Symmetry: C3
């Protein structure tokens, strides 16, 4: 029961730590630009490091939801692979935005690809779950 | 094991796609008002479309947590129904805010109703889980 | 199957309600300072109550992910205990920030401790899951 989800649990834990890294990066930018909380505004660089964090934070439950649904209704290893791709693309996203708001686009689109890939695999897993029973009951109309 | 959660997995996937739609709406408003990232400020309409997104993003894990706990400790179909009600109310919430910050209140309160409904069903499911064992051990004090 | 997760389901439901309380607190501060949505800016007190909410909202899925992974791969009761510690530290965090942005640091670091504690227990639970099979297959190289 726990073995069939252990790769998804590993990839989830990686995602949590990746978010702890992003929080450390924003904490470090708060000292590197003297931005006192509750302020979110500063130079065109504090805002970029900070927004990259804010975005990744928002997108994290979308990642968790898809990783777990794709991992349980389609291959767990396949879902764990896109889960690693997404997370890695996010490090690049953050690192790119932390430079210019342009250098974030390419790893942002890489993150999108992995997110749609998980959505498709979750969709195909649920389709393959409900469709045969539907096709069976639908064709059960002949009488 | 996966059949008893397949409706919750479906409703979760709907929620993920609803969030992808909200992100597309904010991306479209960024071009329709020339709002360059990392800026979140613009006309009284870019901010509304953008805030509606920000709010739905925040409330998504609350929806996921409740949908799954209510779906596992009370009827899965019942939880999947409020889960559909909440998500539908959110589309209206977004669409209302995307007009005026007043026209969002009614579908916002509809979303709240569905959220409290899931909380109650999760609460009743856990109550019915722990209470009989408590009542039994408590009454086991007579000696 | 549901009994071995019932404490994590309880602690999750507590977290959801704690977030509903934080939303009520921000709604009350919006009337107590006449801050019309979609504005997030006001006195040095509306922003603090509001930011405390925004932060807790962000950190909630990190809490959920860790609580559930630690609860399933290490003791459920132990994970449910740190889960209660984290949530309680968050009430103090909110209440401290709602006063000064300094009085939030101590319950913020208390919240961090509980978060790293869950991460370690999830890590130890997965380590103990994968490591024996690895050590076995690795030592299986003698031939
Ligand atoms: O030492 C750190 C930085 C750690 C780090 C980050 C990136 C790369 C390498 C090391 N921090 C303190 C606690 C920290 C913020 C303050 C509140 C909090 O809950 N935190 C938290 C605790 C546990 C978890 Cl698993 C989590 F995701 C968040 C994170 C940053
Ligand atoms: O084409 C789209 C729009 C799709 C759409 C939206 C509403 C209605 C109809 C179609 N987008 C690109 C990728 C998008 C943002 C960029 C990063 C990212 O992760 N994305 C993401 C990818 C997959 C998932 Cl399932 C997700 F939730 C988010 C979403 C918007
Ligand atoms: O009466 C309340 C306040 C309740 C409260 C808060 C703290 C302590 C004691 C009582 N509110 C209305 C609905 C509320 C916001 C509007 C939209 C929404 O979804 N909401 C929501 C509904 C259900 C859940 Cl379980 C949730 F987390 C959020 C929360 C605040
Ligand atoms: C919030 C992300 C989805 C949670 C995953 C639920 C999977 C339960 C496993 C049933 C067997
Ligand atoms: C983060 C939302 C809760 C996740 C749902 C956990 C349900 C596990 C199923 C145990 C049987
Ligand atoms: C998003 C938080 C993690 C969800 C927990 C998944 C646990 C499934 C139980 C498998 C047995």
């Amino acid at each position: 029961g726990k073995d069939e989800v252990a790769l998804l649990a590993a990839v989830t834990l990686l995602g949590v730590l990746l978010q702890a890294y992003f929080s450390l990066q924003v904490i470090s930018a708060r000292r590197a630009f003297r931005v006192s909380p509750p302020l979110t505004t500063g130079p065109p660089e504090f805002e970029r490091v900070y927004r990259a964090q804010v975005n990744c934070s928002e997108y994290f439950p979308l990642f968790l939801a898809t990783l777990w649904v794709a991992g349980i209704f389609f291959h767990e290893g396949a879902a764990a692979l896109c889960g690693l791709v997404y997370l890695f693309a996010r490090l690049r996203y953050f690192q790119g935005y932390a430079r210019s708001a342009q250098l974030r686009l390419a790893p942002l689109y890489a993150s999108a690809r992995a997110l749609w890939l998980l959505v498709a695999l979750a969709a195909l897993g649920l389709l393959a779950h409900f469709l045969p029973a539907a096709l069976r009951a639908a064709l059960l109309g002949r009488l």
